[PDB]
């Protein structure tokens with residue numbers, strides 16, 4: 244009746260040592276270096292393929308150690324159909340004193356939203372469903388006061404059933420900047436969760452037109468492209484920007500009117516145009532939230548409030564702590580050894 248603890252095995256792949264539980268077999272590197280050190284593997288406990296990631300220099304510095312801890316805490320929290328989740332986390336270490344390596348196991352994700360677009364032309368139904376699922380995932384993460392901040396097509400995984408998950412592949416072409424709200428890009432003020440809604444608007448526009456909405460080359464070019472669509476800030480919004488230099492810069496610019504989006508996105512479903520208007524509002528105090536957006540008539544064939552859950556509370560009191568490297572490392576170790584795995588999925592077989 245004691246819980247089994249795994250036996251590990253060791254191998255080399257691409258000049259990298261991999262030491263993993265024997266349940267993970269046929270490790271094979273994936274993404275030719277793009278995603279970091281990641282292998283596909285067959286999980287013998289589930290009969291499915293998974294991704295195994297060996298973290299890079301997880302405790303290099305206080306910053307890296309806190310980053311490691313943060314990512315593990317977040318991954319462990321996420322329990323939602325449209326957000327990446329954690330299948331397993333392990334280390335070959337048998338104590339904190341020999342703890343150096345952290346491995347994360349996730350589902351093997353679908354191609355990203357760029358790949359989807361490159362390979363097929365999307366129907367309005369699939370645009371509705373893909374944007375719906377992003378918003379569904381955002382309702383969940385936002386309810387726990389978690390903001391993504393990095394939404395872009397490469398951080399959205401889509402499978403052959405058109406099911407979507409939100410993730411963040413992190414550090415090291417599509418610039419995250421192109422999808423970023425001005426107030427967060429430019430540090431105008433303390434921002435809200437609707438920075439992510441701006442990104443959804445930018446993604447939706449691109450799915451409708453086939454073109455990047457605001458492909459700015461730097462912060463000033465990005466701002467100018469944005470204001471050309473949505474118009475220069477009004478008096479109400481200008482008062483909420485803290486920096487006098489920022490305000491003075493903004494006022495130096497040529498006045499621009501808000502464009503009529505029905506002219507810009509001509510051909511698109513009028514409901515999609517109306518929702519884009521509500522997502523790309525410049526003043527983030529007036530921008531639609533994820534939960535509100537789910538109720539928009541554009542999503543009438545997918546929306547179901549009783550199937551759009553919120554998240555359990557997430558304790559982010561660690562974010563305010565200044566700790567030493569070994570303290571962040573020990574906290575990470577605690578999270579590894581406290582991990583409780585999810586149950587297997589339903590295994591109904593249609594053929």
Ligand SMILES: Nc1c(C(=O)NCc2ccc(C(=O)N[C@@H](CCC3CCCCC3)C(=O)NCCc3ccc(Cl)cc3)cc2)cnn1-c1ccccc1
Nearest residue numbers: 278281294296314317349350351352353391409410411413
């Ligand atoms: N390559 C892969 C994987 C893979 O790599 N899995 C491991 C993995 C682990 C964590 C995350 C991950 O998302 N972390 C997040 C977690 C929290 C996040 C989740 C989304 C909602 C908001 C919270 C994370 O913390 N970010 C780090 C972000 C970051 C890091 C550094 C900096 Cl400076 C800024 C941001 C994502 C993948 C799986 N399939 N495939 C595949 C896909 C196509 C073909 C072939 C193979």
